[PDB]
Amino acid sequence: AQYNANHPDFPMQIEQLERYIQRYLVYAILWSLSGDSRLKMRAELGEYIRRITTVPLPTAPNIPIIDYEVSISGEWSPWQAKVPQIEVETHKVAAPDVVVPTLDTVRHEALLYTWLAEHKPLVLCGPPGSGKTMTLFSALRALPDMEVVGLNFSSATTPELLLKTFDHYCEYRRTPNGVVLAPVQLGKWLVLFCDEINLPDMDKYGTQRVISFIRQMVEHGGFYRTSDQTWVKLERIQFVGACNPPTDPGRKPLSHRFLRHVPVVYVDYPGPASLTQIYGTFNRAMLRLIPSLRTYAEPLTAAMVEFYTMSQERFTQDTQPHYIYSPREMTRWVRGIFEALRPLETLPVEGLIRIWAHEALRLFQDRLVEDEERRWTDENIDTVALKHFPNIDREKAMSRPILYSNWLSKDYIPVDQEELRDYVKARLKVFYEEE
C-alpha cells in the first residue's frame, strides 16, 4: 500500500505482487520459525526450505537465505548492500547513540521495525551486552510516533511497578464504553521497555504475577483497577521485553500461554569478524586525533578483540556470578582510550600501548577475585600486546605500576607511584582538618 502511495501513476501490478509476496513469505517463515535460535539453526532452516520450496531463491552457493531481504520490486537483495563502511565523527566515538551498521544489526532493525509497526509485543532474548537495548532503541528512531519508557525488572518485581509508571506517563479517563488508559500526550504510542522480564520470581506453584499481569493486558487489552474493581482498557500502549536466556542463573522460563502473543528474537554476541568491523571503525575515528598513530588502528583493534576473546572464555559465570564479559567492556575500552587521548596533542606508539594496557586492567582485572586470575591477566596483557605490537620498547610501555591520574596534571597522564604517594599524603592532611 505504501508503494502505491509513492507511485500514484503506476499502481503495483499483480505479477509484481505475486513475486513480492512469494519472496516475502519465505523471508517471513525463516524469521518467524528461527528468529529465536542460533545462526547455525537459522542456516539449517534455510537449507530445508530451499530443499522443498518452489519460490525463486537467491543463487548464492553458500550465502544463507537469511542474509537476503525482499525488495519492494520483488527480487532478492543481499543485506550486505545496506551496511556501508561508515566513518564516525571523532567527537562521537563509542557514544551510546552511535551504532555501527552490521549484518546482524540491519536484519534485526528491519525485523524489529516490522513487529513494532503493528504494535505487536516482542521480546529480545540474548546474553547481556549483546545489543538488545541498542537494537530496539535504534529501531525506535525510525518510528517518530513512539515514546519508549525503560523499566528494569528484578526478582522482587510485582505488577505495581507497571502501575506507578501508568500514573506518571498515562491518565485514566472516563469514556461511555468504560475506563480507558492512554498516555497523557496525544498521537504517540507509549512503549514500555521491560529490560529483564524473566527475573521476577515464581511462587512455589510456578507462576509469575507480573508476567500474568502483562499477559492479561496484551490478550484482553486491559486489566482491573483493584481500587474499585473496574475494568480498564489499554489504548496506545505497547509492551517490549528483553531478557537473558532462561538457562542463565537466576532466570526463569516464561509461561507458554504468555509466549504465544510475544514473538522472540535471539540477539547473539557479535562474532570476531563483526567485532573487528565495529570497533575497527571506532578505532579509526578515535585515532584521527593523533595523525602519527593512524597506522596502528588495525593492530590496536585486533589486540582489543583478541584479549577480549581470551578473557571471555577464561572467566565464566561458573566460577563467579559477576564474571560476565560483553561488547560493553570493549565499548568502555574505546571510551577509556579516547578520553585519555583527547587533550594530548601527540603521543608515541609506546604511550598508546600503555593507555591500551591501562584500560584493560581497569576493565578485566578489577572484578577478579583471587590473585591467580589477576596474575593471569597481567601476563596475557603483555603477550597480546607484544604479539600485535612488535619492535617497541617493552619496559617503556609495560612498566608494571601502570597508574594514570589527572590529580598531578590538567590532563589524564601516567603518574609515578612515589609522587602520587606524596601528593595523597599532603591531601590527606587537608582532608583531616576539613572533612
Partner 1 sequence: SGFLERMNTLLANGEVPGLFEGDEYATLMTQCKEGAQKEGLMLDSHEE
Partner 2 sequence: RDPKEWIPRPPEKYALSGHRSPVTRVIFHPVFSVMVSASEDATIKVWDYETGDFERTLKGHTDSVQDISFDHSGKLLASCSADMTIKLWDFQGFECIRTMHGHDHNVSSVAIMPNGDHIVSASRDKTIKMWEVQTGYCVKTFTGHREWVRMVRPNQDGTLIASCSNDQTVRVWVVATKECKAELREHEHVVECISWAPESSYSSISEATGSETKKSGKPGPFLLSGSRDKTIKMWDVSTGMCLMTLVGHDNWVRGVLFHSGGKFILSCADDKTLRVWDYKNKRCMKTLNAHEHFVTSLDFHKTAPYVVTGSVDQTVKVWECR
Ligand X SMILES: Nc1ncnc2c1ncn2[C@@H]1O[C@H](COP(=O)(O)OP(=O)(O)O)[C@@H](O)[C@H]1O
* Chosen from ligand X, partner 1, partner 2, none, partner binding at 109 (C-beta under 5 to 8 Å by type): none
73 binds partner 1 (CB under 8 A): no
428 binds partner 1 (CB under 8 A): no
Residue positions forming the annotated binding site for ATP: 126-133
* Chosen from ligand X, partner 2, partner 1, none, partner binding at 103 (C-beta under 5 to 8 Å by type): none
105 binds ligand X (CB under 6 A): yes
270 binds ligand X (CB under 6 A): yes
Q: How many residues bind ligand X (CB under 6 A)?
A: 17
Residue 409 CB, shortest distance to partner 2, in Å, is 5
Residue 36 CB, shortest distance to ligand X, in Å, is 16
For residue 237, which of 163, 300, 308, 295 has the smallest C-alpha distance? 163
Which residue, 288 or 328, is less far from ligand X as judged by CB?
328
Tell me the three-class secondary structure of the chain, residue by residue: CHHHHHCCCCCCCHHHHHHHHHHHHHHHHHHHHCCCCCHHHHHHHHHHHHHHCCCCCCCCCCCCHHHEEECCCCCEEEHHHHCCCCCCCHHHCCCCCCCCCCHHHHHHHHHHHHHHHCCCCEEEECCCCCCHHHHHHHHHCCCCCEEEEEECCCCCCCCHHHHHHHHHHEEEEEECCEEEEEECCCCCEEEEEECCCCCCCCCCCCCCHHHHHHHHHHHCCEEEECCCCEEEEECCEEEEEEECCCCCCCCCCCCHHHHCCCCEEECCCCCHHHHHHHHHHHHHHHHCCCHHHHHHHHHHHHHHHHHHHHHHHHCCCCCCCCCCCCHHHHHHHHHHHHHHHCCCCCCCHHHHHHHHHHHHHHHHCCCCCCHHHHHHHHHHHHHHHHHHCCCCCHHHHCCCCCCEECCCCCCCEECCHHHHHHHHHHHHHHHHHHC
Residues 80-99 that bind ligand X (CB under 6 A): 99
Residue 367 CB, shortest distance to ligand X, in Å, is 17
331 binds ligand X (CB under 6 A): yes
Which residue, 146 or 275, is less far from partner 1 as judged by CB?
146
**The binder of ligand X chosen from 34, 133, 238, 301 (CB under 6 A):** 133
Which residue, 151 or 179, is less far from ligand X as judged by CB?
151
Residue 88 CB, shortest distance to partner 1, in Å, is 26
Residues 124-163 that bind partner 1 (CB under 8 A): 150-152, 154, 156-157, 160-161
168 binds partner 1 (CB under 8 A): yes
71 binds partner 1 (CB under 8 A): no
**The binder of ligand X chosen from 82, 233, 288, 328 (CB under 6 A):** 328
* Chosen from partner 2, ligand X, partner 1, none, partner binding at 201 (C-beta under 5 to 8 Å by type): none
195 binds partner 1 (CB under 8 A): yes
Which residue, 171 or 248, is less far from partner 1 as judged by CB?
171
Q: Which stretches of the chain bind partner 1, using CB under 8 A?
A: 150-152, 154, 156-157, 160-161, 164-165, 167-169, 184-185, 195
Given the rule CB under 6 A, which residues bind ligand X? 99-100, 102, 105, 128-134, 242, 270, 278, 327-328, 331
